[PDB]
Structure formats: structure tokens, C-alpha cells
Amino acid sequence: ATFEIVNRCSYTVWAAASKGDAALDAGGRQLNSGESWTINVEPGTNGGKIWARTDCYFDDSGSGICKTGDCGGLLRCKRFGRPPTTLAEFSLNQYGKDYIDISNIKGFNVPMNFSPTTRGCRGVRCAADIVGQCPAKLKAPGGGCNDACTVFQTSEYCCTTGKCGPTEYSRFFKRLCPDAFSYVLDKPTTVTCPGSSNYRVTFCPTA
Template identity: 25%
Template sequence: MKFVARSGRSDKHSLRFHLSMLCKKRSPRRRPCHKKLAPRLLLSLSLFTNGTSTTVIPTNTTANVTAEFASNLTPIRLIVANDCAESIWPGILTQNGAGPGTGGFELTPGASRLMFVSSNWAGRVWGRTNCSFSSDGSEFGTSNGLDGNATACLTGDCVGKLNCTLAGRAPATVAEFTLQGGSTDNQTFYDISLVDGYNLPMAIIYYPSPNTTWIPPNLTNCACIASAGYLSSSPYSSPTAPLDSASYLNTNSTYPMPFEPIQTNNTVQAWCPVALQVPATNPVAAGDNATIISNPDNGNPLTPHRAPFQPCLSPCAVTKNPADCCTGPYNSPDVCKPGLYSRSAKRVCPDAYSFAYDDRTSTFVVPYETAGAGWEVRFCPRGRSTDILRTFGEEVQAVGAGTGLSLEGWARVRSWAYIEQRETGWTGAGMVVRGSAWTAVVGLVVVMV
């Protein structure tokens, strides 16, 4: 996916909207105000012993380490990596705990940056594209943003600043983290979110501490790839799949990864509703369902009348309508329901948040660790979107609860046949998570506002 040249939009995007998106209460899970974060490494060494995996986190990256280097207050490694063909400018927002000491920086193709955060950190990481900053990053860029005003980046912009102090402007694919949550503060929650739209493929990789090496990587390492050029052919999770699938997302032949099996490089150019493409090709009125569904191109393969895929805005970013934003009278999972954008996003990225109350099929949980663990946020991974929560929902529940897997669970996470059976039955419409106790697991996080 080549980052496109800028073009103008007439929609206004105010500081007030930044703040409302940041502080929106979206979930009975009770997470911190809005969302979370992640890391990357250049090289990793995986050791396999008796069916378990131990990942050694490297310290040699291509960018400088932040000032809080491995202090007692910041024992958790956070790595951000760029596998894109062009430079990106990651944005980082800390919502709780000690952050990495920076809110943004440039990351050239193939580069990564090692940082450290506290074990109670909560925040979010996203990538900005097509940016232009002053030499010290302190002033607005010189190019026009989506609303015609002076902003620094086409997507994910932080009010024109290199060092982000607010949530990035839509559209942006976001990694969200709450490292210490749950009713007894003994769980870590994380996810990939498309609630603010989509601009870049993303993966989150968990590097366990010595206490959590028993957790299989095919229950923790998720990816969302909804851009042509980064999508590998399907089937990707089978013994005859391409060789790179054997190590993609730090998985291995012992623990095969379940992937979304249907999308192609043609279909991922057409998943974004036409009215939400960047730049938008036709106007949108309030109410995503009424306006966008009427467009005959929605959900269809690329046609001569449809522009090639660009970053995709969320309905909320375009209409500001409470029904699209799950705000006001719609601030409840009983009232706010997925629309066309959410359903389309879920088809291409089954493990990603597609709207504000998409908790059951989008939230990953691991036991909380005070030190030794690490996280990677990787932009533009090449492979396929994962389908972990639909396939192994019960097993992810058990990991998050700290109870370990049952014998049947261990058998399932090691079974190619089980994954292929689940993939064969996938219709692309709606997600079903096995295990009725999931709500009890994700309903324990406490929101800090």
C-alpha cells in the first residue's frame, strides 16, 4: 500500500472531538478512558520445550532507547516497528502509569524502537502517514489535512505536532493496552481497534515473562491486514502454507495460528464503504446505515466507478452522529449496534474492534506481570489477519483467568485439523465465540476517568 498524496476535505475536526473520542466510555469492561498500546523487535529467538515456548526479547533495535531505560518504574518493554515500505510517524498516548517518555517520532522502513513503560501503564499506539513537520517537530506541517486546514499528517494527525498529547485524528488503526486491570488488578487487556477507522496493517505480539511462557503464541499474537500488497494467499494456516507462515507472529508448527481464510488482494481493496474512503468520494449524512447501504458499490469487488482503496474513516469521524459514535442516548451495548462499516471491518479483521461495544470478539487477555514481559506493535506486517477469538475463545478466556488450559484446550490449540474445520465453517457474516463465560472475564476492568 503506497501512502497517497494529500487531498482536502471540508469536514471540521476540532479539539473537542479529539477529547470526546479519547474520553468516550465504551464498554462494560470498564477500561481506562478510550483505548491502549504496543511494541516490536528486529530479531527474536524462540525456544521450544515440552510443547511450550520461551521468547527471548532482543535489545538491539535500530532506534534509540528511551530515557526510562529498564528502571524499576518502567520494567515492561514496548517495541514499535515499521515493516511498511515508507516512513511512518508512530503516535503514543499514555492514559495511566509511566509512559515511554515520547509521544511520537519518525520511524523509517525496517526500523524499530525499543522503549519502556510501567507495569500499570495504559495507553494507545497508532501510525501516522504522509507527515510533514518543522525541523524540531514543534510547529504545524505545511500541507493541507483532510479538512483543508494546516495539519502535519494525512492520517492519525496530532493537532499538527510530532509529540502527541491527544488521541490521533481518524482514520487510524490503533493498538490499545491496559497492562493492569480486572477486579483484582491481575489481568492485562489489549486489542487492535478500527473504531477510529483504518489506515495501516497492524500486529500486536506478546513476549511472555518467565511466569507466562506456558501461554501458546496462537492465543496472544493478533494481526489486522486489510490492505492490498500486504495480504498473503490463503490457506495460510495449514501444513502446506507458505514457509513464512510457520514463524509469522512468532507462532510455530506446535501452535498453528488461525487466520481469516476468505479475503484476497482484490477484495481488501473494496471492503471500505465508498462514502468513508479517504478522500471521501461522495457526501455522507448522519446515520451510517441509511446513507452508506444505499450505495451500490458497498461490499462489492473493485469496479471502474470505485476508487482504489484508501484509508477508511469510521462513520463517527464523518457524521459525528451519536448513533455512529455510541454516545449520548446510544452509549450502551444494548442500544449501539454494528453498522455496515463495522460488519465490513470484521470480515477483513475478525480479531479487531469494529465499533465501540465490540468487546466479546476483540479483547485479548493475559495474566498481569510486574516485570519481564514485552510487547511489540508492528506496522505493515505481511501475512493474514488472525481469527483467534472466534477459533479459540474458550482458551483465551482460560489464559486471561490464569487457570490454564484443559486437556481438551491444549489439544485444540495444537490441532491443524481443528483450525481448518473452523475456517471451513466461516461464512464471513458475524463472529461466534465459543464459551459462554467471556462476558464475565471482560466485565472486570475498571475505567479510570
Template identity: 30%
Template sequence: MGQTFGDLLRCCCCNSCTPASRWRLKSLIRNTTPLTPTPLRLAFLSLTASPTLAACGPGERSVSFVNQCVQQVWIGVTGGAGDACGAKNSCPTGQACNTNNNTCYYTLGTPAAGGYGLAAKTGTAEFCVPAQTGATQWSGNVFGRTGCDASGNNCQTGECGGSPCPPGQGGNPPVTQAEFTLQTTASDFYDVEIINGFNLPMEMKPTGGAPYKSVPDNPYTCGNPGGVTPLNDTLTGCTWTFDTTVGGTDYASYLRMVAPADPQTACTADSDCSGGALCGLVQQGASLSRMCGSEIGWWSGDQVCGVDPTFGAPFNCGQAVPAANGAFGTVANLFGCVLDKTGKPAAQSCYTDGASDTCCGCPNWPYPTDDGKTCQAINSAWTTSVQPWVSFLKNACPTAYSYPYDDKTSTFTCQSQAATNAVDYTITYCPG
């Protein structure tokens, strides 16, 4: 029997899910029907902004947001799952009940300062995460929603079906996500993730709250994934600039996400478009096609194959993977690091000691890993069919999670000196 949506959120948001679980969770989130958005050109500008912090109470953790983009951004939240809820059992403080499945999910609740809609260039907000008696204080992910109406709905990216996202439901990918689990007496885990594509540059970083626990020098300890500043001499900052040339060919029309123009016009290149429109990929239901429109983000090969497992060139999602390279079945499964078996079990990570060449991965990125370990094996089919598209993402942001087993260069931890973890965080849209 497969895992439910709540089960997947519970394990994945606590940093304990398998790649199969992560892939299925993202598939559930992305396989909702998007609306057809109105055109809006996505632009980024880095400006200096600092949140006006409220005073969070004892034991609470501050999570602040800063919008440095040239457009308004609405905060999206996908909370991890907790206990069952219903008429006779309400959710604990800091969680809300989704009555569709009677499950509690972490929420950020009402901001202590600001609101969910962040004004262009200067918008800020702060949330006070309630103290908890259990091991986990908060778990889930946050993202940015763009091109929304005045109420923060009907968005071009991060859309939730024309309404506020209910507890536990994420917005339609592609969206950039900051994923984090805040723990009461242990290290927090956090990352910036673009496995399923990109809609906004994002950075997550600790911003005080308490002195950090003393640890050996490690860029993945209390660092800032998604930030533009290098973490050391070899772990560079993110340019958030996407080079669409893969293998010597420009695939911009397949990688660019656009809001289609009105009237809709099919295209194969920018030269087919007029009025400043660009050629890119558009999702309509379960199908993908190239149309002229305004740029609103970038697709990943993993997300394209998740929407349409039969999508052809250049991703070749339905292409067979040789049995000698593992029981993946198709390239779509190879993107997700899952096997072509009942329940889509996880493939072996190529970072695992004793891994064979039927594992999933593995790129020896030109960046340090969190523990110094490099690939223990390499799957040639993955290197040929998947790595070029993963590199498209990773080159734009070396500290971002770019494929399901990218933990070694993407997972960050932080803990305060005191027995109770009290580190606060700031998430910035369009950092710089």
C-alpha cells in the same frame, strides 16, 4: 455535568468506559481542524523485521515497534489521564504534564532503542515502560502517523495541528489504534481498534518477557489482534483489504480517505479523476466532500457521522431512528451506541443478559466470542442502518474492534505466571 477529556481518557484507556464515554472521547479527538495534506499514495508491503531490543530494567515492560510498510511511519501516542499536575506537583515517572489542563498523562518517553520516526520497511524502536507501585503500569493507545514532514509533523494522517501531539491528545482520525492497559499484578487488556476508520494495518502481540500464565485454550488470551495469521480454525487473520461494495453498490468514493490533489477537483467516481488520482472523501474543518486525490486510508460510518451528524446518503447520519427501536434519535447516535438524551448516555449492549430489541447491536459474527456468548437480542434498526458499514471494517480484520460493543470478538488479555505481570509486547505496522 459531562465528563472531561481527561476523565474520558482515564476510564476508556483502563477498559472501563461505557460506549457513550468511548464515543465522546473519540469525538473530542476527531473534532480538531485538520490540515490540508499534500498527496502521497499509501502502500503496504510486508517484510520481515525484528527490533533490536535494549535491556529494560527490573520491573520495566518492553513495548517495541516494527515498521514493515513501504513508507516512513511516525509513532503516535495518546496516554491515559492520571493525577493533577502544576508548579507544585509534578507527574510520576512515566507520565507528563499537559499544562493546558494541568493533568498528567502516560507517555512512552525517550526510546531505549530507535526513535519515534520509523524508516520504511526496516524501522524499529523500543520503549521501556517504568515500573509502578499502583495497579496500572501504563494505559492509553498508540497509532501510526503517515505522510509527515522531516520532523514528524504536518502529517497526512494522525495529524496534531502541525506540532507534536501534546500529552493526552490523539491524532485526527481516521487512524488505526492499538489500545492497551498494562497492569502490575493482573491481566493486561489490549486490542486493535478501527471504529473511527483506518490508516495503517496494525498488529499487537505479546513477545515474551516472562512465561504466560496457564489458561484454557482461548484465542483471545495472549493472541495477536490485527495479525494476518489465523488464531484458530474459525477466528481468521486480517487481510486488511477493504471491500467497498455494500448492499450490492460500490461506495468507494464515500469510504476511501484521500489527500486531495492540487488543484482540488470534485468528483463522484474515479472516472472523474486523472493522473492516477482516485475519488474519495476529504475532511476540511467540519465538512466532508468528495475530491480526487491519493488514497491514505478508509473512513467508517461512525467517523463520518461524528464529523457531520447531518451527513446524508449513504450513511444517512441525520435520519430518524423509530422510537420502537430505542431512544437513539438519529442514525449518528445509533452508530455510537448512545441515546439522544442529555450527556449521551450509553445504550444497552445486545450481549447483555435480558437485553431488549432496543439495545445497540448486535451482529452474530462468524467468529468465536471470548466467552462463547452470542447476541441476546438484536435491534433491527441497527442491523439495517449500521451493521453493513461495520461489516465493511470487520471483514478486513475480524480481530479488530469495529463498533462500540464489539468487545466479545476484539478484547484480548495476557498475564505472566509470576505475581508481577512481566509480559512484553510488539506493535507492527503493516504486519505480514
């Protein structure tokens, strides 16, 4: 499947794409404002994620650090990135269907629209000013708004027992972005699309 990743933000982001134990395509690239990066993701990919990283520095070997979304210091991510990170998530060709969603379960750093470029389903977006409105206890010095699990590490925020409810903190992400997962057992906002759809991820879709 092809994904076009577009930076509409007025600032540079370093895009990342991983299935958590391997890079998807090159795994990461710098995107200046307005740049597009087209990647190919093998059919059947389960548990893929794409995110933006902010304020990164990399040397000539692609080793460095980012203030949000850092994936063990690499330009080309093999692993998932450090919260806070707005996530585009996807499982492809699962019994003839593709499943996409946006998640705030690992916090928010950059607004995002995640839409099919092919026919037969709709896109999802989280474009509100979550960092601006972030509760003081969730604010990341880095930039970004962390999820409560990352900050407090409780069974309730992390849903570690498989039983947990919405919280003051999850309700905040949900009020600003109703179409993004706000906690692990949130009522699913997954979109089902035709198997082998193609997609576009846009950072700062409103910008």
C-alpha cells in the same frame, strides 16, 4: 513494560504512543522502512494507544502535520491522533492482568500486528487491505478508511446512547478484520495476558 514498535511497511511512518493526556515515552518518532523503536511504558498504564501516522512533515521544532493520525501537529504526541488510525490499545497491570486489543473504531490507516514478546497469551492482527476495499463514503482523501461515527456523527454509529447495533459500515471492518473492534459495543476481542508482559507492534506485518 517494554514495547518494540517495528515498521515493516515499504514507506516511512511516524509512530505515536499516548495515554490521551500525556505522551508515553517520547510520544512519537519517525520510522523508516525496517526501523524498530523500543519504548518503556510505566506499569499500571491505563488506556494507552499506539498508532502509525502517514505523510507527515515536521520542522526543526517537531511541529508540522500528518495526513493520518495527526496529534495536534506535534512529532511527539501528547494527545490521541485524528482518524483514520488503526489502534493498538492496552491497559497494563489491571488486577494482575494486562489487556490488549486492536481497534477499527476510529477507522484504519495502516495494517498492524500486536503480539506479546513474553509467554502466556496470543497476539492479534488486522492485516487486510481495508483501504483498498473501503466503501466510497468512508474513504479519506488523506489515505485511510474512516469509521462511520467520524464521517456521519449519528447516535447509532457513535453509540452515544450506550445502545447501538452493528451497521453496514461496522460489518465491513468486521468482515476484513474479525479480531479488531468494529464498533463501540462489538463482542470484545480483548486478549488477556500476564501482568507485566512485553510486546511488539509491527506495522504492515505481511509486507
